[PDB]
Design a protein around this ligand. Structure first.
Ligand code: NDP
Ligand code: XCF
Length: 158
């Protein structure tokens, strides 16, 4: 089973200068709950962004660098390797990977950040004609989590 996992804002910004443009603890917890015990797949730049692999799940990095050999990371070198990985695989980032996968994945777990940020990376446009809302749940706001946001689970129609 193959899912996208992503947070994008009202204009589908996902990234600025190789970071997330927002501080949102609730979203990162969301990620941890979903992906813990399973597999992440991510592109090189995204890994450099997180910098080490996430504990307690199988971290996998897509890169062309056949020199790449990082402790605690599986490495793959084509897209087509993804379909070999067993279990629940999450496509984790970033823009290049989403672009390449969005047409391929079963479903997407999207956090809509209900704001407009400055970005330099974007999620590809998509249509609800194509995507059934299996659930939609407002994140809770609070002293520490102050941007409105919604957890969407979308499943490919038809
Ligand atoms: N808000 C969110 O949900 C998330 C946002 N982001 C944001 O996304 C942005 C990063 O996206 P982007 O810059 O596109 O980088 P990516 O994280 O998608 O990594 C791009 C790299 O992945 C490798 N790669 C991708 N496709 C292939 C392929 N088909 N075959 C071999 N290697 C491949 C290449 O690495 P190499 O050069 O080593 O060959 C490529 O340069 C950042 O701004 C980050 O903050 C990232 C994750 C989540
Ligand atoms: C691009 O930056 C990140 C992307 C991501 C990826 C990511 C973040 N948020 C959402 N909703 N989907 C994603 N695929 C993460 C992330 C990032 O910054 C360190 O951090 C956290 C924990 C501390 C490591 C988790 C994920």
């Amino acid at each position: 089973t193959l899912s996208i996992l992503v947070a994008h804002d009202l204009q589908r910004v996902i990234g600025f200068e190789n970071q997330l443009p927002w501080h949102l603890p609730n979203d990162l917890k969301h990620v941890k709950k979903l992906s813990t015990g399973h597999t992440l797949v991510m592109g090189r730049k995204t890994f450099e962004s997180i910098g080490k692999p996430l504990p307690n799940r199988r971290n996998v990095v897509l890169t062309s660098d056949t020199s790449f050999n990082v402790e605690g990371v599986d490495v793959i070198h084509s897209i087509e390797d993804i379909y070999q990985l067993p279990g629940h695989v999450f496509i984790f980032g970033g823009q290049t990977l989403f672009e390449e996968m969005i047409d391929k994945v079963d479903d997407m777990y999207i956090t809509v950040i209900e704001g407009k940020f400055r970005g330099d990376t974007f999620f590809p446009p998509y249509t609800f004609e194509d995507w059934e809302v299996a659930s939609s749940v407002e994140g809770k706001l609070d002293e520490k989590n102050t941007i409105p946001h919604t957890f969407l689970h979308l499943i490919r129609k038809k």
